[model samples]
Target: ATQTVTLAVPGMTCAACPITVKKALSKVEGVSKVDVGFEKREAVVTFDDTKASVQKLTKATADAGYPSSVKQ
Candidate 1:
């Protein structure tokens, strides 16, 4: 089964921000897809939970220079 997670991202000031976040998540092992919205300051990720975790997702966003937190 696939698991979906939403993150509240910070420092996304332009449309290009989502592109960065999406690229970062795409590099992860089990991240199947990524949808990010700069206006909403959120990123929705669909991934295989067995191969990846929320922590890893968050780290990826951070590594891309955009800090984020998992939203409940």
Candidate 2:
């Protein structure tokens, strides 16, 4: 099954930030989709559960210069 999550990414400073964030998530192993919102400072990610984990998702964004905060 696939998993989806809305992660808070506060480091996005402009419209171009989403582009970087999207690219980062896309490069992840099992990420199927990534919708980054600069206005909302959020990233909606969908990925295969078997190959992806929340920690990986957070790391991907962080490595791209955007750190994610998971509320839970």
Candidate 3:
């Protein structure tokens, strides 16, 4: 099933930052949408829960040098 997760990406400080984070997250298997906010330093990802896990979502950003955790 499809699910959404909002993550805090504190490293996103420049305009180019969101592009990389979005691209990296988009590469995940089940990701359908990626909304990144540089000012807020966060990302909202929509994906199919059955195809991908929350762990993979975090890993994707880490691979792109943007480590993140679920927004509280």
Candidate 4:
């Protein structure tokens, strides 16, 4: 099944961070979509739950220099 996660990426400060975060998340195995909102400091990611985990999304963001946590 597919799932979506809203991650709190408070470290994203500039417009460029969104692209970086999106690319990082997209590189993950099962991620299908990534929407990084610089204004809100959040990332809404969609992926196949069977192949991707919320932690993986956070880790991807962190590796890209923006540490993130699940909103809920």
Candidate 5:
């Protein structure tokens, strides 16, 4: 099954920041799509739950230099 998760991201300063974030996330296995919003400071990712986990996704974002937290 596929699941969609949104994360609150900080440190995004410009439009390019979201693009960089999305590009970084797209490299992850099982990640189908990524939509990052600089204005909202959030990222929404759709991925296969079986092949990936939220924790991994979050870590990947952090490693990409943008730490994030699960949006409540």
Candidate 6:
């Protein structure tokens, strides 16, 4: 099933940071939509957990040098 999650990206220090973060997330297999905000320093993602997990989402950003966590 499809679900959405808000991911925090505290390392986004510049406007381009969101671009990097969004691209990294978009590359994941199950990500259907991605919205990143530099001011908010976070992202909204729509994905299929059956194909990708929250852990995988964090890792994707981490691999891109922007570690992330699920917003709580």
TM-score of the candidate numbered 4? 0.86
Off by over 4 Å in 2: none
**Candidate 4, residues 1-72: lDDT per residue as tens digits?**
688888777775678667777777777778888888876887888988788868878777878888778763
Those runs of model 4 whose alpha carbons end farther than 4 Å from true positions after fitting are none
Residue 62 CA error for candidate 1 (Å)? 1.0
Show pairs that collide, candidate 6: none
Candidate 6 lDDT over residue span 6-69, tens digit each: 7788886677657777776677778887778776788777788888866766666667678788
In order, candidate lDDTs are 0.74, 0.73, 0.73, 0.78, 0.70, 0.74
Lowest summed lDDT across 10 adjacent residues in model 1 is found at 53-62
Give stretches of model 3 more than 4 Å off.
none
Query: Highest lDDT, which number?
Result: 4
Q: How much does candidate 5 score in TM-score? A: 0.82
For candidate 3, lDDT tens digit of each residue in 1-72?
Answer: 888787767775578657777766678788887778876887777888888756667667767687787652
lDDT tens digits, residue span 1-72, model 5: 688787666857576556656765666678788778776887778888788756656655766678777662
lDDT by residue for model 1 (5-50), tens: 8776776657766777777666666888877877688777888888
User: Candidate 4 — which pairs collide?
Assistant: none
Least accurate 10 contiguous residues by lDDT in model 4: 12-21
RMSD of each: 1.5, 1.6, 1.6, 1.3, 1.6, 1.5
Give the candidate number with the greatest TM-score: 4
At residue 57, what lDDT does model 4 achieve? 82
Distance from true location, Cα of 19 in model 5, Å: 1.6
Q: Give the lDDT of residue 46 in candidate 3.
A: 81
Q: Would you list the clashing residue pairs of candidate 2?
A: none
